[PDB]
Amino acid sequence: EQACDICRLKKLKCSKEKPKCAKCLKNNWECRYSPKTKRSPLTRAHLTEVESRLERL
Amino acid sequence: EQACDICRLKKLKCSKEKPKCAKCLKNNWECRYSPKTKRSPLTRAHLTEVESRLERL
DNA sequence: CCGGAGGACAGTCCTCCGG
DNA sequence: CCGGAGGACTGTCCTCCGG
């Protein structure tokens, strides 16, 4: 499912074949399929927490 | 057709029948269907705008 | 090139059961 | 009194379309 970094960067269709996907292979570009990087919980708790820690001070 | 506030904080079934749902008619209580609580948007930019604006204090 | 559909999915948001 | 289950809804987050 996870398209590579470069087709990601590019908003294109990845073929998804590890080691180097079709376009990287053929273009001798680095095929890195990087991890999905973690964000903050987008939870009503964490929004009103932090929008009220801020507006308080 | 939304529950009234007494049944609401008592977590009871409402008949939602305006102006007086059955329990407040039967029981002679003030019935109020106070309106849609507006909140801030649990969207990503607003979470981020705000923790950035707190990380900046 | 890159905004946006398309959509599966996460976490809300109210309600009322049943202990 | 209330924990949290059930369900519609809201917005996400990912990918790849299509001008």
From Swiss-Prot, chains A, B:
Coiled-coil boundaries: none
Entry protein name: Regulatory protein GAL4
Compartments in which it is found: Nucleus
Additional detail: Present with 166 molecules/cell in log phase SD medium.
UniProt remark on domains: The 9aaTAD motif (residues 862 to 870) is a transactivation domain present in a large number of yeast and animal transcription factors.
First and last residues shown, out of full length: 8 to 64 of 881
Lineage start: Eukaryota, Fungi, Dikarya, Ascomycota, Saccharomycotina
Gene that encodes it: GAL4
Top-rank lineage group of the source organism: Eukaryota
Binding positions for Zn(2+) 2 per the UniProt entry: 4, 21, 24, 31
Subunit structure as annotated in this protein's UniProt entry: Binds DNA as a homodimer. Interacts directly with the mediator subunits GAL11/MED15 and SRB4/MED17.
Entry comment on modification after translation: Association between GAL11 and GAL4 may serve to expedite phosphorylation of GAL4.
Portion annotated as DNA-binding: 4-31
Amino acids binding Zn(2+) 1: 4, 7, 14, 21
